[PDB]
Amino acid sequence: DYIVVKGAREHNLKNIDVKIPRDKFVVITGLSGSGKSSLAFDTIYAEGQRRYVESLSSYARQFLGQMEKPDVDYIDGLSPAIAIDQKTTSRNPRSTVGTVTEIYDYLRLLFARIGTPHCYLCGREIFACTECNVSMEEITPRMFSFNNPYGACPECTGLGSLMNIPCPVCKGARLKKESLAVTIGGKNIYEVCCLSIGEAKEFFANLNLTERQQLIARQILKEINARLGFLVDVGLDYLTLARAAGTLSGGEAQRIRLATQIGSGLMGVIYILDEPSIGLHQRDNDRLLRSLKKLRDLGNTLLVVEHDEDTMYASDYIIDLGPGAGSHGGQIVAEGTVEEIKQNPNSVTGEYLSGRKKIEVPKERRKPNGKWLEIIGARENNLKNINVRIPLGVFTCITGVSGSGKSSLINEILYKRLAAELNRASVKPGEHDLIKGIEYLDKVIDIDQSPIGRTPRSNPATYTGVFDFIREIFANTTEAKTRGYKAGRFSFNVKGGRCEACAGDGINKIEMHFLPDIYVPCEVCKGKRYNRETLEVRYKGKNIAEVLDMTVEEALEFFKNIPRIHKKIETLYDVGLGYIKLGQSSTTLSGGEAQRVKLATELSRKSTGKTMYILDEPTTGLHMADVHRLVGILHRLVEAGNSVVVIEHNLDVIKTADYIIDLGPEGGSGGGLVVAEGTPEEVAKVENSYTGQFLKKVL
Amino acid sequence: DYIVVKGAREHNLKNIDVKIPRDKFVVITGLSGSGKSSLAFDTIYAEGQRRYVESLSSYARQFLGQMEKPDVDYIDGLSPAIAIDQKTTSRNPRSTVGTVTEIYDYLRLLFARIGTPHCYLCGREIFACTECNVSMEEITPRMFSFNNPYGACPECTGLGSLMNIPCPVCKGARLKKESLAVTIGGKNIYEVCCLSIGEAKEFFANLNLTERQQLIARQILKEINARLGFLVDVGLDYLTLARAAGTLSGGEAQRIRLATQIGSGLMGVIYILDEPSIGLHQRDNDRLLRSLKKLRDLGNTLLVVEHDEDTMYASDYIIDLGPGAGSHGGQIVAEGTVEEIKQNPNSVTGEYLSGRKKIEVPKERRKPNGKWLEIIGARENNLKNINVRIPLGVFTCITGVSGSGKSSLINEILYKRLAAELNRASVKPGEHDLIKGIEYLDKVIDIDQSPIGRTPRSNPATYTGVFDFIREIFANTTEAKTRGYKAGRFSFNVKGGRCEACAGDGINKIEMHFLPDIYVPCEVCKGKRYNRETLEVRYKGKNIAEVLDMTVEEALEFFKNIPRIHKKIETLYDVGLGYIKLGQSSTTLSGGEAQRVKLATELSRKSTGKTMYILDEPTTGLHMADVHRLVGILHRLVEAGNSVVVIEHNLDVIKTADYIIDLGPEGGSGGGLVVAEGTPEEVAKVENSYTGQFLKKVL
């Protein structure tokens, strides 16, 4: 009844042991990069998945790949583990929302059972019609499926789009003309799938059937209603069953997977979730928590990595890691219920939970200086031809419920148009007329969690530009002048100073007969990426490799004398990356580390006062202290004369914003409008706004 | 706490429902082809595997394939399912017994922890030696692994055999010369792996370590001892950790998988096993049952398809299907504990359990007629250069414990030599000198469970030769003579009578854009495999397609007038295939059905009295009634003047044999000898023979 883990030394874990209770709601918390995500996914999920995959067939196990064995002594009390995260892929066009949620099969069964046959030539009711003289075969569930030759459209082989343009025959219905003739309640299968989830649930609720039809089709109706209710309680009440799976975002895919797992009813499975509440409005938090509790009540163990206060208060057991990040983290500081953590004096989460540390609402807010950005005729996706004014020089937050269209309206329209107008891009913008006020801006930079590189030749030091200064100060030493060296000698990108064996990468590729490529450190350079002649030069007792190896915190004291390097190192420390090292490969950096590197690079630049920054959910996977630091950094950037636009669902970040734009009042076809605009105080006075109500409650 | 299954209609299941208790020892029983194996594997295992695979990554799920959805209404209370069966594959040479059992990792850890360094050039002890002037790196567990560049032999990339001949450098050790220098207790890792499992366990038990060594290496020793004990209790105490996984047989692989599953300690997993006791001697039955109970006691549900009496008596819940096979089966006849089934008057298993029906020991036994088969210098595998005499004209059974070498000695030596001498084969026989008495035999036929064909053009009717008689009697009708037809017209292999659309196969291949090939019935012939002109001819109110469609039981009454067809149909009914149809495709036949078809074909032949039949475990997946029928058929074949040699572990079949040859007294290197020979009464008088003791107890 316990999951005993001993000798966990994965990544930065400091040889810790823990006993996680089974069949309970367990939440893991900690600072960003403190090792909680590693401790969960790389140890427990990896072991649970491997112990089940290895027992399967040899062909399937090899096809799925060989998961790396975690550095753990022994794990006791383990079950097969399923991980849900925002890591979806396009996969294939054959899969849609209905197929993933396993409701299309029930729809096919219902249409085969109580469907009403019809003639596609004469339009009358029917197994043959005396008017059109056409004979039809027996009704089977296989006919309504587009994955079989009996029902798939012959022109587009049941894909709905010739390889992409829509199929002219079925117009994307993915089914034969004869199959679509069968209609239930005046709507065929395609029309039912085209409806929204809530609309479909309402239609099924009030559907009228005869006594025989109700008697024969009851379990199917019950299952369909239960699955639709699960989907609604999850939060995706605006989606359509006919939507392709690839087009869904990470959060939508994760929530769909959660709903499918709830519907399946699997028992004795360890579920590991990575921030289920991300990309979700505050009003859906209670429903999400209820859904999580319902999933747990099926006989499953829940391991949720969430920093939400409501999730903390609704959990059974909380495990806190820290007290810092990187080399300062990897230890269990607090453990117990929420009350024990709140009373714990050495817990980072408890300090914010008890109210000792909190984000203070500013007493003064900036005002626009007559410069505005106007968007005219925004009609992309569900936008109802609205016009929005975005003030310049202030901190602007775009709020609204999920599916309101804020992410599309920002990313696919404003950022694309600004990039085309300023950076001379080659990407088609969204459906809009024109943008007024572009001349007030000079450049636009988008900050996200995408990796900063794909090769080991890119490092945070090189990205921030401090590597050039380091090379110059190394070449300015007495030894370099004596030996006639150049500033480019101390670089792993130009031949002459780097090691020729690994070409400056520091690693070598070894190919096995029946195994994938394995990367090992270079033997000639011992992973130092430099030859002996270059490494012979030392400045202040340290060489170039030693300088690259040390962390930002050590570099702060080491480079106190040089002001130009000191400024960049101080910026990197202020963006919260004091534990990282300058020589770390960009391929190993996480999303948060890459975002912090980009923020530090933007801060170090000489702002001209005509720069616009766009951030899409910057608080993904961030603790309360990380949120406070990010708010401070954003406020500093705004005070630097630039403009910041952030799409955020966190109330703490929202309450500190200067301008708020609300999109709603619902999601999907029910949204795309503008509800409230202005300062947070003004928005809090709007009655018909959920964000306004939550802001009024917070303030 | 229950597994509720409703509306199960897979294959021949007659829409049954059942409630299987959870976390209990459950045994499913029934006649061969009664639908128990289908009801278990195709429904429960398929659903449990699919509900876990679909939740995994898209790339892994598609790589592992898409399991077919069973025809079941709904299943409640399900967990991920693991199926263990004799369906292993060669896979890759990179996997051995130790790697599969997950003991090689612990061996590497132990050698890295308490290993004794040594010099491979001077032979002295050592991190460098002042004599050879050679420096060695730090000892790490990765060095002892052959799947990494640090330890793999460079000549053969860590495979142990260049692509096959052994690597001249490492001589199959799969490791570098420096790695093998580290020895624990006078033996390196390769020598430890080369030892038998029991010998290795004994060596580890009496291994002497210092106080510090014992303190630092205790968990590893405990895990190694536990895994070795599990392997011994399973029954494979003669295997070697260095043996390749591909060379293992089906039973050995299944038992290794069982031992690995026990060692892993997974919880909340439904385990489905297909005859775990097959290929195992009676003396290991108690140990196997104890191992199964220990595996269940970890919090798992056991679904065992076994016909053993001891398994029935050691189980918690028994579900019995029947009462017949094929169309007569697919229903739950009895359900409850062993006492309830024994008292049940309409249970097939209970009738044999209570003693109402039993196999009677013959009161007289046949004697050899001076004709014997002599094998001289049999040295293949573990045979210790023994000579065996096999009498001719009688029923001979080859017994012995697992690993004694009976299967090798028979199949790879005697059958191969007889085939080369008589049928003019091109397969190299085993290590033997010569065989005396070959001139007494005319031909040798081996009967196994391999499929009788790979195309739909082969059917049991064509295999037995009755199809030619059916074609002749169809062409002898008045209509065929009037239309000038030929005997070859009513055949799906020659153009002229068969349907040209499907070329007589009856199915068509349809290729999808992103899906594998799908086979559907031919539209032109409607699956009848004949054109309208041929089908127009009817004999006694039935056409050729109708004749092919009907079962053997109906054909018995239909073809009473024709004696030649009646004899073959009666033979097919007597071999227990009265439920099968003549037109069934050979690709869909199971192993038991194929074996019965081969037995019927052999029975229908005109025996010349100089034929030898070899059967390897013919009682695989057979009920008690099936065993009785097989014993009767074998006795009839022996009485037909031929010779039968059967390698069987079942005591019921053994007690009815005329001659018994015992190989032992142990398995592996401890066996390969001859213990007892003669009649079962004589064998039962041998004290140092487990088979003799069991025969004495039975008689």
Ligand SMILES: Nc1ncnc2c1ncn2[C@@H]1O[C@H](COP(=O)(O)OP(=O)(O)NP(=O)(O)O)[C@@H](O)[C@H]1O
């Ligand atoms: N490729 C697409 N095809 C059809 N409809 C789409 C597509 N992409 C988005 N939509 C819909 O158009 C709207 C886009 O809203 P979007 O801006 O993506 O969501 P949001 O309000 O920011 N919520 P969230 O992503 O959950 O944080 C939603 O109603 C989507 O369902």
Ligand SMILES: Nc1ncnc2c1ncn2[C@@H]1O[C@H](COP(=O)(O)OP(=O)(O)NP(=O)(O)O)[C@@H](O)[C@H]1O
């Ligand atoms: N390819 C191989 N390489 C090495 N040893 C082998 C190989 N095949 C078999 N052996 C060994 O040689 C002997 C062969 O015995 P075998 O006849 O296969 O077993 P058996 O006594 O019939 N038992 P079972 O198969 O369990 O019913 C055993 O000791 C095996 O471990």
Ligand SMILES: [Zn+2]
């Ligand atoms: Zn009509």
Ligand SMILES: [Zn+2]
């Ligand atoms: Zn189409």
Ligand SMILES: [Zn+2]
């Ligand atoms: Zn190098």
Ligand SMILES: [Zn+2]
């Ligand atoms: Zn030496």
Ligand SMILES: [Zn+2]
């Ligand atoms: Zn080698």
Ligand SMILES: [Zn+2]
């Ligand atoms: Zn045809």
